[PDB]
Design a protein around this ligand. Structure first.
Ligand SMILES: [Cl-]
Ligand SMILES: [Cl-]
Ligand SMILES: [Cl-]
Ligand code: NA
Length: 176
């Protein structure tokens, strides 16, 4: 562990500027697609909150937000630790993820929300590791497909640390 935190990184994969550019570009597209619709943006705690927060700045249409907290009992079966606080019937739902990996938990969440009689349901993920997929799920909106290496920053943690970086990258191997 370095006193200076950026010194913990081996490589920066996405700078803050890169991430903000992705938010602007995805936000413009999402604005197009959801303008005038009853859009609810749903984040899955904890890490997705950083990306969501920046993404919704750039969605220039009315929307509400909500959050869920879920735990795997990956077996497809998911435990709801915090459910949505508001109804999604007749709403257009966008689940906002920091990273899509196996998809298993996310697939189960989409099945649940679909049962609530939404108008539509789509996923926007900042990062995608498609090689990791185990469930039959793909995001309509993807920021960047990345190598299957452990990354941290911008919501993504190691041992609960590093979610505060405004960029994303790989750690030196002496850190883990
Ligand atoms: Cl943020
Ligand atoms: Cl709404
Ligand atoms: Cl990772
Ligand atoms: Na933010």
């Amino acid at each position: 562990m370095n006193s200076v935190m950026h010194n913990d990184l081996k490589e920066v994969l996405l700078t803050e500027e890169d991430i903000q550019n992705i938010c602007k570009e995805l936000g413009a597209q999402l604005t197009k697609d959801y303008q005038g619709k009853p859009l609810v943006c749903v984040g899955i705690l904890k890490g997705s909150a950083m990306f969501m927060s920046d993404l919704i700045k750039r969605i220039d249409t009315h929307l509400s937000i909500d959050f869920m907290d879920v735990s795997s009992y990956s077996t497809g079966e998911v435990q709801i630790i915090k459910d949505l606080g508001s109804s999604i019937e007749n709403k257009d739902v966008l689940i906002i993820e920091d990273i899509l990996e196996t998809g298993t938990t996310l697939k189960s969440i989409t099945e649940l929300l679909q049962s609530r009689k939404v108008n539509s349901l789509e996923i926007v993920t900042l990062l995608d590791k498609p090689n990791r997929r185990k469930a039959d799920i793909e995001a309509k909106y993807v920021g960047k497909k990345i190598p299957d290496e452990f990354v941290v920053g911008y919501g993504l943690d190691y041992r609960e640390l590093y979610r505060n970086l405004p960029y994303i990258g790989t750690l030196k191997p002496e850190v883990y």
